[PDB]
Design a protein around this ligand. Sequence first.
Ligand SMILES: OC[C@H]1O[C@H](O[C@H]2[C@H](O)[C@@H](O)[C@@H](O[C@H]3[C@H](O)[C@@H](O)[C@@H](O[C@H]4[C@H](O)[C@@H](O)[C@@H](O[C@H]5[C@H](O)[C@@H](O)[C@@H](O)O[C@@H]5CO)O[C@@H]4CO)O[C@@H]3CO)O[C@@H]2CO)[C@H](O)[C@@H](O)[C@@H]1O
Ligand SMILES: OC[C@H]1O[C@H](O[C@H]2[C@H](O)[C@@H](O)[C@@H](O[C@H]3[C@H](O)[C@@H](O)[C@@H](O[C@H]4[C@H](O)[C@@H](O)[C@@H](O)O[C@@H]4CO)O[C@@H]3CO)O[C@@H]2CO)[C@H](O)[C@@H](O)[C@@H]1O
Length: 476
Amino acid sequence: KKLFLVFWWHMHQPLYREPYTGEYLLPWTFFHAVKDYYDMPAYLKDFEIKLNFNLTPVLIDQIQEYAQGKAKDVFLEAIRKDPDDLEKEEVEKLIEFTKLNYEKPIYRFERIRELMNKEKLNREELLDLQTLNLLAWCGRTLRKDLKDLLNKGRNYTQEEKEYVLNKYFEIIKKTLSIYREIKEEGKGSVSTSPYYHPLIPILLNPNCVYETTPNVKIPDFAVSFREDASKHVELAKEKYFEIFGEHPVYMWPPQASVSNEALELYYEKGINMLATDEVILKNSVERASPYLRYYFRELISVFFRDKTLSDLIGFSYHAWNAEDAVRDFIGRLKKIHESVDFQPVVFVVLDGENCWEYYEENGIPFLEKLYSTLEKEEWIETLTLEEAMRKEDVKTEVIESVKAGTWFDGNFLKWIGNKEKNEYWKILIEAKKKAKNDYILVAEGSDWFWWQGEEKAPFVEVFDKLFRSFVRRAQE
Ligand SMILES: OC[C@H]1O[C@H](O[C@H]2[C@H](O)[C@@H](O)[C@@H](O[C@H]3[C@H](O)[C@@H](O)[C@@H](O[C@H]4[C@H](O)[C@@H](O)[C@@H](O[C@H]5[C@H](O)[C@@H](O)[C@@H](O)O[C@@H]5CO)O[C@@H]4CO)O[C@@H]3CO)O[C@@H]2CO)[C@H](O)[C@@H](O)[C@@H]1O
Ligand SMILES: OC[C@H]1O[C@H](O[C@H]2[C@H](O)[C@@H](O)[C@@H](O[C@H]3[C@H](O)[C@@H](O)[C@@H](O[C@H]4[C@H](O)[C@@H](O)[C@@H](O)O[C@@H]4CO)O[C@@H]3CO)O[C@@H]2CO)[C@H](O)[C@@H](O)[C@@H]1O
């Protein structure tokens, strides 16, 4: 009697490439590529477990651009430059970026503390600010190779900065290949999402917000996004075919978002299985065990993730010692294992690149201890998505209807509802009336609405600039 454990790490970035200048206006795709996107599947090289991954096609596009040397990244150019050639604006954006990440454990360098107490920086101090920002995002693989430079902590030269950059781009160049390798070796399944990570339920039927938040105000959806919804899925199938050689049979719905109509569309497009959130299941069915494989209308397989276990990694364990956190995690799986007489399937699903920056040492002590302890447990069998879809000694249930929602409170309020987010949908709706190319699909990505209508934060202007630029470009 085994507990079946399914890790599904979801990787995504919206398109930071501004369509008129061709410039990557934020460096987040680069920094999460060198820190997490290669290194997360790379754990499978050292640990005999199964781990699954989601790669959005818009993320894949940017990884390709960086890997091929075509990405003009404005922040990264400020990093690469000799400090004597830095513009005042570039120094300000460098300092701004440091302040934003300053309290995170991966930025725990004494020299960063010294430099941010300084009101004017010379060439050597700017070289340290540039290079330590690079090194703060160093992933597990290169933290071994670059350990001498990392322990330095200060006094970096342009030659050393350039060396780190060359190693980082080598990491990026091998990133798509290692997803292909762990997939071909059976160490994990790889899924994708509709192309630009949109909210498929809203594009299909904006009225589905009223299944959870009946009081919410939405704009006049005077155009249909239903065909655009199909296009996100179809284009995603094409990009996945290019990278991995098959049409995808697993998809992660952006924000875990599902509806009766969205599940229909996924089935119609040949998706055999997806996962969503436990809150959906609780909102939809009275007797709701998340340890079963569900069949929506006998059309498509649905797993409901263990929200508690997913939220321990995403939200709790960063503030713990690695050893305490893994003993807690295994202790919870043991109680699940001891709680039922059948073999439960336990889906752990969350973003794969966003939580580790808040852990000590980028979560490497935690994940190494976690994966080491998992592979020693005889009563735990980690599964690929393919193995979870096919496993016969697993309990099964049919569900006929779900309440539309997301894994954020089970509703859509993080992307629609208040004046400012609704203004984005107004802009999108008007632009869709006049759209002439697929940049309208880029503007349907969920990220733009997430950051809109929120307390002012540094760089929120860039997401707004990107969204409006994609909207403008879509109509030309
Ligand atoms: O404002 C108060 C608030 O601020 C702080 O949050 C800030 C972060 O700490 C800071 O680093 C920065 O966040 C960045 C982020 O680091 C950067 O990587 C990028 O985020 C990407 C994700 O990396 C990417 O995975 C994707 O995220 C999706 C995800 O795929 C999906 O599954 C789901 O979870 O939604 C996510 C969002 O759509 O895309 C995003 C970009 O859209 O960009 C971020 C913004 O610059 O800035 C944050 C805001 O200031 C504190 O951390 C927080 O506690 C404070 O309360
Ligand atoms: O900025 C603060 C935090 O940043 C990081 O958190 C990330 C997570 O890593 C991502 O996975 C994602 O979080 C998802 C989350 O996985 C999903 O379960 C859901 O979580 C709900 C949760 O059930 C609920 O109980 C409550 O705690 O709020 C969550 C949000 O409603 O939805 C999340 C949003 O997509 O993104 C967050 C950042 O938003 C980092 O890991 C944290 O340490 C950090 O505090």
